[PDB]
PDB file of C-alpha atoms in Angstrom:
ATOM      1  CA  UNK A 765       0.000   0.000   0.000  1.00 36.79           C
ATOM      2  CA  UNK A 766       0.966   3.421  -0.643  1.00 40.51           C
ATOM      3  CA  UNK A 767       1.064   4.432   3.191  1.00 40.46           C
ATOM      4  CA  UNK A 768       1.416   0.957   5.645  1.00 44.82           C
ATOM      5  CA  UNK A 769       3.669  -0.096   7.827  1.00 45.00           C
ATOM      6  CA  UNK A 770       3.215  -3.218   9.459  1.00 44.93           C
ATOM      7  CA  UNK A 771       4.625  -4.167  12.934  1.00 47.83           C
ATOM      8  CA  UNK A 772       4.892  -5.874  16.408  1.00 48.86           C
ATOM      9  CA  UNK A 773       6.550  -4.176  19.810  1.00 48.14           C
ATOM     10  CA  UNK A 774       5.457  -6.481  22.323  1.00 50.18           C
ATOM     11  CA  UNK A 775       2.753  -8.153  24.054  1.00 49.69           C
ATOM     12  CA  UNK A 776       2.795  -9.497  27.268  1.00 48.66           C
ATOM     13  CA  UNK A 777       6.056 -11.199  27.735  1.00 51.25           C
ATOM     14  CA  UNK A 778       9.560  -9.233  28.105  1.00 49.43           C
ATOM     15  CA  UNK A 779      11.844 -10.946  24.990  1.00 51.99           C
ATOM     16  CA  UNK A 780      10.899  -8.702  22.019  1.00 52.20           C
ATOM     17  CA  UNK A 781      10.485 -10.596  18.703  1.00 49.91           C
ATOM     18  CA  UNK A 782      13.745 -10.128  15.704  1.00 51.29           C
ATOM     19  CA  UNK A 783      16.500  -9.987  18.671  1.00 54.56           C
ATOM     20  CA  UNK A 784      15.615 -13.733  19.419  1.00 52.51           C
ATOM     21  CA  UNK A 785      18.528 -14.160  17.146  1.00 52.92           C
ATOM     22  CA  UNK A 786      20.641 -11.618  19.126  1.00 52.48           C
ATOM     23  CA  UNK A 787      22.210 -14.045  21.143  1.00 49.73           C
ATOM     24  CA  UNK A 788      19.471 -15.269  23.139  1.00 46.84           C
ATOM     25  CA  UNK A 789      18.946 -18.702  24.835  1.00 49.52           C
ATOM     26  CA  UNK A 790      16.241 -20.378  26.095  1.00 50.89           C
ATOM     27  CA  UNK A 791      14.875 -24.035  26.212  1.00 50.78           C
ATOM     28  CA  UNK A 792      11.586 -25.589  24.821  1.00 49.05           C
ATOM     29  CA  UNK A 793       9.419 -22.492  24.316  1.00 52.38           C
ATOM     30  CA  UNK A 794       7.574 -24.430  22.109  1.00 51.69           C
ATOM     31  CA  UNK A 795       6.122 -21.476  20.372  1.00 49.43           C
ATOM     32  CA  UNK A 796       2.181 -22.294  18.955  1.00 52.12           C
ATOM     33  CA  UNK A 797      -0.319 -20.311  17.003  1.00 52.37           C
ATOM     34  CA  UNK A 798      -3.632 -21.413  18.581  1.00 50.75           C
ATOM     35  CA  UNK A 799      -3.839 -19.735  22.325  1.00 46.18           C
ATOM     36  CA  UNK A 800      -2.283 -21.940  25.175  1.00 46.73           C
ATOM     37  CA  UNK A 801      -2.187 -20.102  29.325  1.00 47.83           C
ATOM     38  CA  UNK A 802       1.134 -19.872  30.775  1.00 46.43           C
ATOM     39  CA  UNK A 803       2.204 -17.932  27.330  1.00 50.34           C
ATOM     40  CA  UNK A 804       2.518 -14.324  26.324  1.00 48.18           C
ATOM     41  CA  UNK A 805       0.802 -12.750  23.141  1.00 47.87           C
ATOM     42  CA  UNK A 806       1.751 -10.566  20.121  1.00 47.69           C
ATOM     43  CA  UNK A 807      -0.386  -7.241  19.236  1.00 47.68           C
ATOM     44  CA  UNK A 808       0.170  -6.547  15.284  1.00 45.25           C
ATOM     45  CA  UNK A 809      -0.701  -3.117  14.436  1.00 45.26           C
ATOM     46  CA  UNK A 810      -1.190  -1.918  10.860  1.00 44.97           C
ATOM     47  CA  UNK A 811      -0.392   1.967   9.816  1.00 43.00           C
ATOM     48  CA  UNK A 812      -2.193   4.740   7.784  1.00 42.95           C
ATOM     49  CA  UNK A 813      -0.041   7.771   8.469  1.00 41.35           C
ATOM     50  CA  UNK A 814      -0.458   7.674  11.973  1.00 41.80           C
TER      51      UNK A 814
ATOM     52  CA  UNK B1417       3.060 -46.902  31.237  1.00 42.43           C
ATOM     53  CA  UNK B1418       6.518 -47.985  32.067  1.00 42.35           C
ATOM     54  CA  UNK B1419       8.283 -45.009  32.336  1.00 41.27           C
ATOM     55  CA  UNK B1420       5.189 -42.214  33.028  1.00 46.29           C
ATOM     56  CA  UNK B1421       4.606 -39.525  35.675  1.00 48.16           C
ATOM     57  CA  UNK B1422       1.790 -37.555  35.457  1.00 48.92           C
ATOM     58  CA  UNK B1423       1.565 -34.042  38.159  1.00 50.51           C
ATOM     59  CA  UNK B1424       0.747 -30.492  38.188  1.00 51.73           C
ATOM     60  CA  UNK B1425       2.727 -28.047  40.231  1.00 53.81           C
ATOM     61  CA  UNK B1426       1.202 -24.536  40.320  1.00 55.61           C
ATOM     62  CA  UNK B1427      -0.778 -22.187  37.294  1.00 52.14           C
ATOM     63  CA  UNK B1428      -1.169 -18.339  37.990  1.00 49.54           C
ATOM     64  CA  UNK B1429      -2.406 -18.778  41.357  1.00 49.67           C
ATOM     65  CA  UNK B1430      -0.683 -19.063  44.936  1.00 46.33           C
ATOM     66  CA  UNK B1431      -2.203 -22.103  46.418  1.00 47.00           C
ATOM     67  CA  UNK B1432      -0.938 -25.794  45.790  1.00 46.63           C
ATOM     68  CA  UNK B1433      -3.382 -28.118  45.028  1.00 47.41           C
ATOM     69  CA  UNK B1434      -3.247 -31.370  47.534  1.00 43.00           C
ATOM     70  CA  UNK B1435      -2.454 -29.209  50.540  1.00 44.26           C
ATOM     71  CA  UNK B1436      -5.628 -27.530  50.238  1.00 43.44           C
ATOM     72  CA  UNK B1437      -6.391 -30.055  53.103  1.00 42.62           C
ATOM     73  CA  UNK B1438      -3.851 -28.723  55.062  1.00 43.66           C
ATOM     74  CA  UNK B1439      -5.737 -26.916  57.422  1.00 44.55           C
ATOM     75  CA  UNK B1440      -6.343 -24.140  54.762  1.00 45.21           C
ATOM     76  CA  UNK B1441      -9.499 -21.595  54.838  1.00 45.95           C
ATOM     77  CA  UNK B1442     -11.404 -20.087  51.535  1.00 45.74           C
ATOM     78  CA  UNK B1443     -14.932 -18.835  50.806  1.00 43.49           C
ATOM     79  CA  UNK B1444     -17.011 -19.947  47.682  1.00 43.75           C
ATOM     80  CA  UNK B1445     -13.803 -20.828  45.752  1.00 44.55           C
ATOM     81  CA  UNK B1446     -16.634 -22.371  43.249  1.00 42.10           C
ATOM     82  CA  UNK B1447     -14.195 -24.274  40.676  1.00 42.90           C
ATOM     83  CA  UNK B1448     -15.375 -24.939  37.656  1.00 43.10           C
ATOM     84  CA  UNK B1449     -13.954 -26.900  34.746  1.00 43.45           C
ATOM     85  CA  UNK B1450     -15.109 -24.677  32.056  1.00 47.87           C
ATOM     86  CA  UNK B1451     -12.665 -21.471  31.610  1.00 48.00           C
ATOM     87  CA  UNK B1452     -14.338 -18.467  33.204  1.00 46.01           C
ATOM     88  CA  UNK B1453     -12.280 -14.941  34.102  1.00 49.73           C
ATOM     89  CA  UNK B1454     -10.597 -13.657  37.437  1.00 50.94           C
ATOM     90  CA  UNK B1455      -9.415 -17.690  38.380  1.00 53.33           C
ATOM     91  CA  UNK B1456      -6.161 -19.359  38.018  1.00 51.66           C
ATOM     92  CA  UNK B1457      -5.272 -21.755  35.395  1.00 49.18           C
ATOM     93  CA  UNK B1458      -3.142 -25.365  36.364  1.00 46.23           C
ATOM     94  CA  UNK B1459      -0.526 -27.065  34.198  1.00 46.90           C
ATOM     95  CA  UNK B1460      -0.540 -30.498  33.516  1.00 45.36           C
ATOM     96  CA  UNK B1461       2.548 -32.414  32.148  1.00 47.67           C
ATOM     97  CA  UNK B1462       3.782 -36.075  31.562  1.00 50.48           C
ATOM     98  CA  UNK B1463       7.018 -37.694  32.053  1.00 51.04           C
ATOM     99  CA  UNK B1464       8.948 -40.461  29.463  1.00 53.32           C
ATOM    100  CA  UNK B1465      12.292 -40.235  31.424  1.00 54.93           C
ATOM    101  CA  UNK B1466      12.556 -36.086  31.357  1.00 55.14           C
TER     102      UNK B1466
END
């Protein structure tokens, strides 16, 4: 589109999505797409100048 | 099974279910199965050996 941005800061959990590669460890996150408790969410936001 | 283990250790909330009979004091806690808001969730897992 002629004015979007799409993006993610954070949702409920402190590690911020695209460093995960920044020299981060962890051990079986065992990320999932349909909603499980005990895990954090993701808020996607869409942009139309502002 | 021969190598199984089946327990739950604690969700979101403080109390540890199987001491609730120790000598421990609540009003209308009023579990229910079905997910409702403003209660504690508990985690379930199963052992092959860790």
């Amino acid at each position: 589109v002629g004015r979007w941005s799409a993006s993610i800061n954070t949702g409920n959990c402190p590690f911020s999505f695209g460093k995960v590669n920044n020299f981060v460890k962890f051990g079986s996150v065992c990320f999932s797409l349909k909603d499980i408790p005990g895990g954090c969410a993701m808020p996607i936001v869409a942009n139309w100048a502002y």
